[PDB]
């Protein structure tokens, strides 16, 4: 009940700082790259589609991956094992019933055994110290959607699209807290669909002016402009569905009027 809207938002603002990954961790990974991470996240987008997982599950899994890779060095042959265990754990946390473990073996073309997946599960729980209720972009967007005048389903869908795109590219998006990315995604989506702008009601609530969102927004604008040429295309394909009003078929604005 809207009695807790404020309390929840304020509390999510507090927890997103605690569940934050280290920004420069890929530099300290000797065997893996942003580009590998990008391939991994893109693959997980597709897996969530195949298995009809909720979008929050994807967002959670990525949070778990980046926090894991912030303290644990991983060889390129095991990065997929990490991702797979992350997706299993996220599904357990978020889904009504998760896919069976066997499904998580199959999705890798049986490159790992069931036992390897399960013991990577254990290791990920250990490193994350069982702290799995991480705030996500998708949570902040969902709360921001209560402030549309009036609610517009292209705006929502496009904001979700932009939110997910940001999961793919560690540089730049690891620099920004989820509430900030959600802020930029919402404005850019609203702007793209209607020409309107980050509402004062959300400026009061988040304490974010449009100007404070500008660095993240310029990044997100470039990402949106360059989305059709990006090596990774799963999110674009996903958001072509009628479910989402084709938003990823709408044309991005060549300027932000900033």
């Amino acid at each position: 009940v809207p009695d807790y809207h404020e309390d929840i938002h304020t509390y999510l603002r507090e927890m997103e700082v605690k569940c934050k990954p280290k920004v420069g961790y890929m530099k300290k990974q000797p065997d893996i790259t942003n580009s590998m991470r990008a391939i991994l996240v893109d693959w997980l987008v597709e897996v969530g589609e195949e298995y009809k997982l909720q979008n929050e599950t994807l967002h959670l899994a990525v949070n778990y991956i980046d926090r894991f890779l912030s303290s644990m060095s991983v060889l390129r042959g095991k990065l997929q094992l990490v991702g797979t265990a992350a997706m299993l754990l996220a599904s357990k946390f978020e889904e009504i019933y998760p896919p069976e473990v066997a499904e998580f073996v199959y999705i890798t073309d049986d490159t790992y055994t069931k036992k390897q997946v399960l013991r990577m599960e254990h290791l990920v729980l250990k490193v994350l110290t069982f702290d799995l209720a991480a705030p996500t972009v998708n949570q902040f967007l969902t709360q921001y959607f209560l402030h549309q005048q009036p609610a517009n389903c292209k705006v929502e869908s496009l904001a979700m699209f932009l939110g997910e795109l940001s999961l793919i590219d560690a540089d730049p998006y690891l620099k920004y807290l989820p509430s900030v990315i959600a802020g930029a995604a919402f404005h850019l989506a609203l702007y793209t669909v209607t020409g309107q702008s980050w509402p004062e009601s959300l400026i009061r609530k988040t304490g974010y002016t449009l100007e404070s969102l500008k660095p993240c927004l310029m990044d997100l604008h470039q990402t949106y402009l360059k989305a059709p040429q990006h090596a990774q295309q799963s999110i674009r394909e996903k958001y072509k569905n009628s479910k989402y009003h084709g938003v990823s078929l709408l044309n991005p604005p060549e300027t932000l009027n900033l």
């Binding site: 893996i32 590998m36 391939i39 991994l40 693959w43 390129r76 042959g77 990065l79 997929q80 999705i107 890798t108 073309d109 490159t111």
Partner: peptide, 4 residues
């Protein structure tokens, strides 16, 4: 799919 096997993946890097």
């Amino acid at each position: 799919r096997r993946x890097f």
